[PDB]
Symmetry: C2
Subunit: 98 residues, 2 copies
């Protein structure tokens, strides 16, 4: 059972990039578990692919904490995080709920 939400992300400087990210959320209900009751999905299931470039993925999946701006209006509002990853500055807009 499916849901989705969209992010945006872009870097600065020479060779700057700009991506849309559609996060497709799938509810797996109650999957099979081991003893104790632990799930090990990275090893159980096949990942999607082919992968985007390495540095783009590291940047999107970076922790960054400091919400530094709020974009958009009304019901479609986005939190901006602003961070560097090895000399490259990134901006990442995340949908923020109510």
């Amino acid at each position: 059972t499916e849901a989705c939400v969209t992010s945006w992300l872009w870097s600065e400087g020479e060779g700057a990039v700009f991506y849309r990210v559609d996060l497709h959320f799938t509810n797996l209900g109650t999957p099979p578990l081991d003893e104790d009751g632990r799930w090990d999905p990275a090893l159980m299931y096949n990942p999607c692919g082919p992968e985007p470039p390495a540095h783009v993925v590291r940047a999107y999946n970076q922790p960054a904490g400091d919400v530094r701006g709020v974009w958009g209006k009304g019901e479609r509002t986005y939190a901006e995080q602003d961070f560097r990853v090895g000399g490259t500055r990134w901006h990442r807009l995340l949908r923020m709920p109510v």
Copy 2:
């Protein structure tokens, strides 16, 4: 349909839920503010839906340190987080390539 990575997110306790998240990446070219300075209409345009429930989204984006790194079908590296938010304990896996 272009470039893709996978994440995993799950909770413990009664009402535990389990989710696969596929992150679809679409290269949009140059960062959205040009030197003129006009905006790319692609930015925040046509967000996907419907959106996942608020506690799920919040959990997915909660700041949390990496507990450990794991593999990963095909020796693919993931960062793991183990954290609590809203009284609920969550586990999270994020694709993190080098």
